[PDB]
């Protein structure tokens, strides 16, 4: 098994999860092809994380490509930035700019 994690990427959870639901449990080549064809914000980030995991598996532990499957994949929440937006009649509103962690673990089938 090989693991790759990206911490505090400026993307809210519940948006990265939609894409991650597509590629869970599928083969590596199929997962990359799927990620290249969906026009969403989180796809380029998740593709980079997946390729980093692939490179780690090939180099450090001496594993083989064309045989790996996405054993684990999830998105967690992280630190939140708080901002303020003015509104009518001299009031204020709060805005939450959220961040997420992305984890992918590949393994030999």
């Amino acid at each position: 098994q090989a693991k790759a994690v990206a911490r505090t990427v400026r993307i809210a959870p519940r948006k990265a999860r939609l894409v991650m639901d597509l590629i869970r449990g599928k083969q590596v080549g199929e997962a990359v092809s799927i990620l290249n064809l969906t026009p969403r914000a989180a796809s380029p980030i998740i593709e980079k994380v997946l390729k980093s995991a692939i490179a780690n598996a090939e180099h450090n532990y001496e594993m083989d490509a064309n045989n790996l499957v996405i054993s684990q994949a999830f998105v967690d929440e992280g630190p939140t930035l708080k901002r303020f937006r003015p509104r009518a009649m001299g009031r204020a509103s709060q805005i939450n700019k959220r961040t997420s962690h992305i984890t992918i673990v590949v393994s030999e089938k």
């Binding site: 939609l18 894409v19 639901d21 597509l22 092809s33 799927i34 064809l37 969906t38 969403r40």
Partner: peptide, 8 residues
């Protein structure tokens, strides 16, 4: 509220 697998 979910996405769809594209045309391959």
């Amino acid at each position: 509220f979910k996405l769809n697998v594209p045309g391959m």
